[PDB]
Ligand binder design. Structure first.
Ligand SMILES: C[N+](C)(C)CCOP(=O)(O)O
Ligand SMILES: C[N+](C)(C)CCOP(=O)(O)O
Ligand SMILES: C[N+](C)(C)CCOP(=O)(O)O
Ligand SMILES: C[N+](C)(C)CCOP(=O)(O)O
Ligand SMILES: [K+]
Ligand SMILES: [K+]
Ligand SMILES: [K+]
Lengths: 274, 274, 274, 274
């Protein structure tokens, strides 16, 4: 009955065109391509209907046939203009310059959206599968760790541990970290909340966390070098993914070569006295 | 006589091409489309005038008729180039490559503006219709609440309560909140200023707020997930939209299903002992 | 001999293609348009030379004449393609698809720069012409003021007063303000540094400021609503633009109408007991 | 055996299509242009295959020859449309409007990437070649300096000194600076960590730094005026590029002219009593 999925998402049901811009960036690429295509056809229909609205003014076109007009409208709106289907007199030539204004316009738009919904990057940060409470520097510290999956660095990265106990009727406690901030994050970061007299989970234990039905949330944010742009990430845990007394395994091996390396294979390994 | 509308706007009359870029992003889409269209026509007129400036150099064109030239200029600037109206000799062919440089250029521009004035997103945050001062955790706290209307989260969101009392001759007091910051805001947030000995509105009452003719302003800001981009929102209240002793109604229902839900229907409901 | 102009610029002479991107955004629009145009011509020359590099493969072209080729190259790179000058066999048709890849490419680029060097907005903030040191709330406060010239608001705006005394050999002191931050700035802001025992200019006087040959710098920054984008501004003063004992004149008139107004006409007015 | 190169890069070996967007921005321009070109050809092959998939419907084309189709597909997808190779009946004309949707689309994309991987600017900040520990204002201060190579200013710039001692097993200490922040950085900045009882390198000496095999990292960040966009920079030192007792040489000459100047020639000069 977790309020929060591992992926940081919420499990609350919400209850309730008017937000086009947002929606446009939001729909599955399948759907997006669809809509664009539809608007593409519809306008050409309109235009080709406007060419018929006057006496057929386009040359090399069958009489009253929309098939021809629609296709002239397309060749005309997309600036191919072979030269078979061609305008006639003032009326056609005007609808043409007007259609073209629209073509050029529609591109600007279509492109603007493409770019808007293209350049939203992911942090590419990995979260540890589990959380561990154990002694660090003489205090039962609760910690979790994250790693940068890419070569390029995230800079001025900051992370937030956040308890969500139940109590009445829901507490949102921002947990104090030994280090909330890292002016740069390129390999691995083990974030830790020392449990002390001000910690909410102070004196707390497993049975008491389950009783509060407490869950923990991680908010990562930073500015990715690769994108010269800001990025974020979430992840959530529950009392049943906290290894008590566990210690994370060292991810830095020294190679036979002698050169130091990072081994993301040990990233989820956790040591425990049994 | 409120200085501030509910929507956060100001009621002060201000007294006073030189700011083109701003203006361009600012005018109603109707007007914007207009201007672009105008510049579109005018240049073609210029160009078509430049084609006439030399002996008619374009083929299949009536003599001295601008109608033909203007339309050749359009087919030429928009790169349709059917092949009926076609250049001749050095002069025409040059104006052509020059016109085309301009077409391609004008698109880049037109598009750049489109995109600039397209990708300014709204926060899609709802503000509570009323403000309520009542006891919270043993102190007369003044509070108001806001909700995220979309699925996607706003992150590192922060809100500001701000008093605007009259006194001489106008005070701008930033009110201290129990929580100015939320590393994430996806459902509902009830912002609260505990009234204590440092509160400006400390000891204050309704009649005294009206006497100061005090108003309150809310500034919301955050970084929207949906847009990977920053967003803001304003809202303002007055002494006559503060329910004294009111309590906001809980917006989280637990469904018969057993799953928890958010009910924005109760968002404006406020309980009051009578 | 001011180190700093009113406009915040520096008067230090600096002593010393390798920075293309920056340069490209930096050069006068005249120059920018030029460069683009040049690259436009040069490539077409190259391409038209590549069409001649094979036997004339383009139809309706004079033999060996580059004039024809260059113009075919343009009609071809800009996708007009009338249909007079047309390709022949494998070679021409290939250079064509290759040229077109380049056309489409060059646009993307040209546009990208246009947009990059277009969407750098100005804050549109006015700085007061003079600075005044005088009593505010029982302390000789040094202050200056700025105003938002546009309707749209700047949000989370912050300002910095900064002394630049000479002493050996140059001090950079960030002056403490009564209010460094304004969660919103839509009309007028009077920024003030109370002179107290920690103020650098504490006990200081005019003759002593001139002796230190001290100057003051203002850094404004905020996030403009109009552009959904960040903006900045600078301005600098000198000891000979500080009215001692001066008071800024109130910029808010109440209209005969009864409605309150902002009068930027009084913005530079400063009252003084004589 | 430095963990960190002068350029701020790491020397850790990492151990391990699924990240297309990132990759696309990441690959050498040579490679990028390649991929785009490939996708350009492949689709045309597909389309030209779709034109053959029906009876040759394009006019002026040899039977079953893909050469013709592929080239018609290109003239058609890139909107040149000479008018030699032209469609026929419903089928061809449809694939045409469909191809064109794709052309226009592919541009939007190609461009979006171009722009994304174009507008990632460099700070253009120079780092001093060496670091020096020596007395400043009565305390052994460790300092290094950086300079703005361009005319345009970086604003709200901040720098971080960061020790990386070995100890078990690696310490990441953020060193306290006399000035971590500069609301503007246009010429030269000498950043300094006073060594006091809280300094990690307090009481430390050269032999002891080498023994800890300590290295130092500099993180620069700010918002460049030239780009109206955020920028960063890194640089790293080692115990063998710290001149003990060294003093940086003054970079500001006063010209014979009388005007003050900045001389980046002395930027790396360091004075030392011998
Ligand atoms: C040391 N750290 C855990 C603060 C953050 C990361 O530093 P790094 O190992 O990625 O360079
Ligand atoms: C708890 N809160 C009021 C601080 C902010 C919102 O948290 P959430 O309910 O949107 O996840
Ligand atoms: C009051 N202020 C001086 C802090 C800033 C501006 O407020 P406003 O008059 O622009 O709304
Ligand atoms: C003085 N400083 C070292 C803080 C930063 C730079 O100021 P400036 O010399 O670039 O104007
Ligand atoms: K075209
Ligand atoms: K064309
Ligand atoms: K044609």
């Amino acid at each position: 009955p977790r309020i929060l999925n591992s992926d940081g998402s919420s499990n609350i049901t919400r209850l309730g065109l008017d937000d086009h811009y947002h929606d446009l960036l939001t729909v599955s690429w399948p759907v997006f391509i669809t809509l664009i295509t539809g608007l593409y056809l519809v306008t050409n229909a309109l235009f080709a209907l406007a060419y018929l609205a006057c006496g057929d003014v386009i040359e090399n076109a069958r009489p009253g046939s929309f098939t021809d007009a629609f296709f002239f409208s397309v060749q005309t709106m997309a600036t191919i203009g072979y030269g078979k289907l061609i305008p006639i007199g003032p009326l056609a030539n005007t609808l043409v310059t007007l259609e073209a204004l629209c073509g050029m316009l529609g591109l600007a738009v279509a492109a603007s959206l493409i770019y808007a919904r293209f350049t939203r990057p992911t942090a590419g940060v990995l979260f540890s599968s589990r959380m561990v409470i154990s002694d660090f520097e003489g205090k039962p510290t609760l910690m979790m760790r994250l790693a940068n999956l890419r070569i390029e660095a995230i800079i001025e990265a900051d992370v937030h541990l956040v308890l969500v106990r139940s109590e009445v009727f829901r507490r949102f406690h921002d947990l104090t970290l030994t280090r909330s901030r890292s002016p740069i994050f390129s390999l691995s970061w083990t974030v830790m909340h020392p449990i002390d007299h001000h910690s909410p989970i102070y004196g707390e234990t497993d049975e008491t966390l389950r009783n509060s039905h407490s869950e923990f949330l991680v908010l990562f944010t930073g500015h990715h070098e690769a994108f010269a742009q800001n990025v974020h990430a979430r992840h959530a845990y529950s009392c049943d993914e906290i290894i008590w007394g566990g210690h994370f395994v060292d991810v830095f091996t020294t190679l036979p070569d002698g050169r130091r390396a990072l081994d993301l294979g040990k990233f989820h390994e956790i040591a425990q006295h049994h």
